[PDB]
Amino acid sequence: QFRNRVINTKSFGGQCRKVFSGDGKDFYRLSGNVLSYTFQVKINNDFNYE
Amino acid sequence: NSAFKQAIQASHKKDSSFIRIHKVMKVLNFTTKAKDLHLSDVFLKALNHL
C-alpha cells in the first residue's frame, strides 16, 4: 500500500521552475528541489486468447 | 444371411499465422553547445554542497 504524505513535493524554494508537459500541453511549476520530472509515454499491451 | 456395410470419414485441418513489426521514427535531433553551459540550479546546489 501507498501510505501518507511524507515529503513536501511543492516547496518551490523561491524558484520559478516552469516545465511544459508535451502530454498535457500545459505548463506546470516543478518544486525547486526535485531532480527531474518528465512526461514521455510508454504503452505496453499483453493480449491472450485461449 | 449376413450383410455388413461400413463407412468412415475423418478430416483434420491446422492453421498457424504470425506477424511481427518493429518500426522506429525520428522526428527531432539536436546538438549541444560545447561551452558555457547553463547548469540547473539543482545541479549547482549538489556540486556546491560537495
Ligand SMILES: *[C@@H]1O[C@H](CO)[C@@H](O[C@@H]2O[C@H](CO)[C@@H](O)[C@H](O)[C@H]2NC(C)=O)[C@H](O)[C@H]1NC(C)=O
Ligand atoms: C540532424 O539530422 C540531419 C539529417 O540527417 C543531419 O544532417 C542533415 O542532413 C540533410 C540530408 O543530407 C541535409 O539536407 C542537412 O543540411 C543536414 N544538416 C542539417 C543541420 O539538417 C544533422 O547533422 C543532424 N543534426 C543536427 C544538429 O541537425
